[PDB]
Amino acid sequence: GMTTLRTPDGRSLDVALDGPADGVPLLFHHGTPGSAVPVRAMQRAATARGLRLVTWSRPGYGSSTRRPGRRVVDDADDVTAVLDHLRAERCVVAGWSGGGPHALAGAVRLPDRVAGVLCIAGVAPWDAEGLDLLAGMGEQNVEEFSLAVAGEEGLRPYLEAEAGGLRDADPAGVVAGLSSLLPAVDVAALTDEYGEDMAAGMREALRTGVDGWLDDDLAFVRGWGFAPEDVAVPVSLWQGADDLMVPFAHGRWLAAHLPRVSAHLLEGEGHLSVGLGALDAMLDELVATL
Ligand SMILES: O=C(O)Cc1ccc(O)cc1
Ligand SMILES: [Cl-]
Numbered sequence: 001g002m003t004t005l006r007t008p009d010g011r012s013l014d015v016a017l018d019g020p021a022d023g024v025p026l027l028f029h030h031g032t033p034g035s036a037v038p039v040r041a042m043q044r045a046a047t048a049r050g051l052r053l054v055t056w057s058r059p060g061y062g063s064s065t066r067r068p069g070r071r072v073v074d075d076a077d078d079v080t081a082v083l084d085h086l087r088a089e090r091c092v093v094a095g096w097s098g099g100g101p102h103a104l105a106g107a108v109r110l111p112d113r114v115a116g117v118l119c120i121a122g123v124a125p126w127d128a129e130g131l132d133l134l135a136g137m138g139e140q141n142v143e144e145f146s147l148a149v150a151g152e153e154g155l156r157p158y159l160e161a162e163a164g165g166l167r168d169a170d171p172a173g174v175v176a177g178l179s180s181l182l183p184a185v186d187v188a189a190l191t192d193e194y195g196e197d198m199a200a201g202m203r204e205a206l207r208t209g210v211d212g213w214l215d216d217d218l219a220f221v222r223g224w225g226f227a228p229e230d231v232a233v234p235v236s237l238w239q240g241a242d243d244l245m246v247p248f249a250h251g252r253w254l255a256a257h258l259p260r261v262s263a264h265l266l267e268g269e270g271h272l273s274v275g276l277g278a279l280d281a282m283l284d285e286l287v288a289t290l
Helices: 040-048 072-086 099-109 139-150 152-166 171-177 184-189 192-205 211-220 248-257 273-287
Strands: 002-006 012-017 024-029 051-056 091-096 114-120 235-240 261-266
Touching: 002 072, 012 072, 024 072, 024 099, 040 051, 040 192, 040 273, 051 072, 072 099, 091 099, 091 273, 099 114, 114 273, 139 152, 139 211, 152 171, 152 211, 171 192, 184 273, 235 248, 235 273, 248 261, 261 273
Parallel strands: 024 051, 024 091, 091 114, 114 235, 235 261
Antiparallel strands: 002 012, 012 051
């Protein structure tokens, strides 16, 4: 259930902490936008493997104190604070989408505590050599990233206009709000329990405004503060060919730059469907790093 953790710099983090109380932590880094609202399918898959699912809202999402100017790597301060709260020597970590860079960061910060990374449709570094980051992206994401590069003053009112349609959205509302970004396989994923969980995640992400979404976007268009080459632990990398939010080429790029990577490039899968259908295979590979 939900708890609050005070960090050393005086911030509060909203933390969703599952049992089992003695399990190895699985730290799940949420997407952009996203929050500490667990996906029930991920809870069931984690508990089946004896993993203790832990997620926190990144600064500015939900009731987590905004931390303006944060880089991707600054999230690893909170990884360390959370694992110290749990008294956990070792963990595995997973990140989806905007969570992918943050999951990798924790591995670089804590190379002897993080055993392995699961990176699901993770976004590539903004200066990724030889990659056109915006190529294959849905036009909503091209617009958002172009505003992010231009700065907070133009990005904020854009995100506030998008948030109008998403802050109270049910699953149908999330589909309507992401029109350019979802292929049919992703729309089909946002039904039933997964859709309810993702919509609840989106509502909590936007409950106190767009600050977490804004600060994530601004972080993704600057230096992460580390390179994928610095991630020494095994990475299980997954990417859908039909993803319009993080194009296939981003996962191909990350797979080429990570030193120890199992790469899975799934035909017919999008940004949402990749995680939903492959969760058992993803967690089997992650747990094998322990
Ligand atoms: O792409 C992401 O990182 C964010 C996202 C969040 C909720 C959702 O329903 C779809 C996408
Ligand atoms: Cl285990």
